[PDB]
Design a binder for this molecule. Structure first.
Ligand SMILES: CN1CCN2c3cc(C(=O)NC4(c5ccc(NC6CCOCC6)c6ccccc56)CC4)c(N)cc3OC[C@@H]2C1
Ligand SMILES: CN1CCN2c3cc(C(=O)NC4(c5ccc(NC6CCOCC6)c6ccccc56)CC4)c(N)cc3OC[C@@H]2C1
Ligand SMILES: [Cl-]
Ligand SMILES: [Cl-]
Ligand SMILES: [Cl-]
Ligand SMILES: [Cl-]
Ligand SMILES: [Cl-]
Ligand SMILES: [Cl-]
Ligand SMILES: [Cl-]
Ligand SMILES: [Cl-]
Ligand SMILES: [Cl-]
Ligand SMILES: [Cl-]
Ligand SMILES: [Cl-]
Ligand SMILES: [Cl-]
Ligand SMILES: [Zn+2]
Ligand SMILES: [Zn+2]
Ligand SMILES: [Zn+2]
Ligand SMILES: [Zn+2]
Ligand SMILES: [Zn+2]
Ligand SMILES: [Zn+2]
Ligand SMILES: [Zn+2]
Ligand SMILES: [Zn+2]
Ligand SMILES: [Zn+2]
Ligand SMILES: [Zn+2]
Ligand SMILES: [Zn+2]
Ligand SMILES: [Zn+2]
Ligand SMILES: [Zn+2]
Ligand SMILES: [Zn+2]
Ligand SMILES: [Zn+2]
Ligand SMILES: [Zn+2]
Lengths: 307, 307
């Protein structure tokens, strides 16, 4: 005798035949992340709640309302990550929820720390609820959700900028706006405008001040141009560039991705400017005044910048 | 001035404009595994050969002839694994090509060692050529191919039995045949027959002798039955079962998968019966007479067994 859900908000009452297994009466069934499909209902977990897959239209609508997918694989990939992430340790590091290193989760830690430091509202209630609970220190469900929403499995190598990009795509960034302009000696002037995720991300450089002062592109014409920002209305910007030695000076950035190693065969650290510089490497904490090292993402805080 | 290929057998001669980059004249282009799409043709690699994606019908047929896919992602996922696997070390361990531990490749090592010990003919010439060359000690291309053919990326956690199953599906196993029979007290007797991959794999048990003496299934009727083998015509069989403590006795099996840890969060070792028992753990070698430990796959050698 059990409860089933797809969202864990709405609970459905089900009495489970006690020699039938779970994946036969309900269908794919789970318990705290464990595939319990092939298991018989034992006296131990009577009265507990089980995630199931949406098998009538009520459950289907509930799953969309909460996760904003109709992907039948979604729930299974989420249960499969939770089974691991719930076994990770999430230590508080300088008042941030971090992740002790496991299962190549270095990039998740760096994402998780960044997310606590930028102002982000998630569209799927499931991401939002799990984000709140992660900020409070219970970040297993959030991490398992990040893996599901990015189509990563536990252990897969990950890109912090790519993870962010996908997460930003599930966040309300509608009020975000970027007015670019490119100087074309031949074609002239031509004012691109970007809203959403595209108004918050750039991949040419780390320095927000260098963006403001014009970055190089090759104009339609062929040879090089300069591409500078005219208006940046957003709560933050994320500047990225392939990893390189870079001086992070204290007080001029919110936080940064440090990455050491080859493309994919490498390890991310998080660097964040508080009253001094903090290197957060999973459960480990380093504190320094200046910092030179290989950075690939820097986060900046905005309101409404105009050129 | 370069050569392009998709197979590396057929070489196409191309002269490459020397201020245009590669991914503009050809398309997605590669060099020894490196995405060279965004790179200009430098004097260093003139006269070398580049993998490209199939962009006319000649290249398309050549790619199928060699790899047996028409999947446009195939070649890119392969180049992306090669870039890593070519950096792995492949030490000879007791006359077998093994892999020094990197990038969670424990399951690949165990597959690679097993593959050198069972009799397997691959259908895609690319797998066959790279298998020969791996048996000789140059196993980077084979491993990168295994990752591509299984849709694994480098670092992903892997299942040795699942990898084998997919590889078997690209091998000639047409002469393989399994005649089962199930004892149903109510329904009666009923002689299943299996050919191909399905005639070589079983997931209930490790002991081939226990298979021969009948394994438990629940007959259509509901309650339990016994399912035993009547004819096993194949060069080998692979017996698998979820990991458990198990005594491998020397001389009664070809090789075995040892796995320690949780579902997915674990580490594979290879155990192989030569003149004594060898534990091969990547580049490391242990030798013992008996062996108790957590086994999940055992390989056996056959000709044409009849009950
Ligand atoms: C489709 N995606 C793309 C790859 N992606 C991925 C990337 C990474 C990764 O490493 N991403 C970084 C990176 C490292 C190195 C680069 N280029 C070097 C070339 C010359 O040397 C210095 C820089 C980069 C050049 C462009 C952009 C990112 C570069 C650290 C930021 C990783 N860890 C896991 C990953 O999972 C799979 C996922 C699948
Ligand atoms: C779709 N596939 C399925 C999972 N799959 C995978 C499995 C593994 C893995 O671990 N596979 C083993 C395994 C371990 C443990 C099991 N069950 C325990 C339950 C009770 O405790 C003892 C046994 C098993 C029960 C059935 C079958 C295999 C079991 C060692 C053999 C792994 N490393 C990476 C993987 O990548 C992704 C890939 C995606
Ligand atoms: Cl949506
Ligand atoms: Cl969304
Ligand atoms: Cl590498
Ligand atoms: Cl590595
Ligand atoms: Cl200060
Ligand atoms: Cl300071
Ligand atoms: Cl084919
Ligand atoms: Cl094939
Ligand atoms: Cl685990
Ligand atoms: Cl682990
Ligand atoms: Cl002997
Ligand atoms: Cl012996
Ligand atoms: Zn309901
Ligand atoms: Zn949505
Ligand atoms: Zn979505
Ligand atoms: Zn785990
Ligand atoms: Zn890592
Ligand atoms: Zn122009
Ligand atoms: Zn200061
Ligand atoms: Zn570290
Ligand atoms: Zn040709
Ligand atoms: Zn084929
Ligand atoms: Zn295929
Ligand atoms: Zn690598
Ligand atoms: Zn491993
Ligand atoms: Zn029956
Ligand atoms: Zn002996
Ligand atoms: Zn080991």
């Amino acid at each position: 005798k059990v409860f089933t859900t797809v969202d864990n908000i709405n609970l459905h009452t089900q009495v489970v035949d006690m020699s039938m297994t779970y994946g036969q009466q309900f269908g794919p069934t789970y318990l705290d992340g464990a595939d319990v499909t092939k298991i018989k209902p034992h006296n131990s977990h009577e009265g507990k709640t089980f995630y199931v897959l949406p098998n009538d239209d009520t459950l289907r609508v509930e799953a969309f309302e909460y996760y904003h997918t109709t992907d039948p694989s979604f729930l299974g990939r989420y249960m499969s990550a939770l089974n691991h992430t719930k076994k990770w340790k999430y230590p508080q590091v300088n008042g941030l929820t971090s992740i002790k290193w496991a299962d190549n989760n270095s990039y998740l830690a760096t994402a998780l720390l960044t997310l606590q430091q930028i102002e982000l509202k998630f569209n799927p209630p499931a991401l939002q609820d799990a984000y709140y609970r992660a900020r409070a220190g219970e970040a297993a469900n959030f991490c398992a959700l990040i893996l599901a929403y990015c189509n990563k499995t536990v252990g897969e190598l990950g890109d912090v900028r790519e993870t962010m990009s996908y997460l930003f795509q599930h966040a309300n960034l509608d009020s975000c706006k970027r007015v670019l302009n490119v100087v074309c000696k031949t074609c002239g002037q031509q004012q691109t405008t970007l809203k959403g995720v595209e108004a918050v991300m750039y991949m040419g450089t780390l320095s927000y001040e260098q963006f403001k002062k014009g970055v190089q592109i090759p104009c339609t014409c062929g040879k090089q141009a300069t591409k500078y920002l005219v208006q940046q209305e957003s709560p933050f910007v994320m500047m990225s560039a392939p990893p390189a030695q870079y001086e992070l000076k204290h007080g001029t950035f919110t936080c940064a991705s440090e990455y050491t190693g080859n493309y994919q065969c490498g390890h991310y650290k998080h660097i964040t400017s508080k009253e001094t510089l903090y290197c957060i490497d999973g459960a480990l904490l380093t504190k320094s005044s200046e910092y030179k090292g290989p950075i690939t993402d820097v986060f900046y805080k905005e309101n409404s910048y105009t050129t």
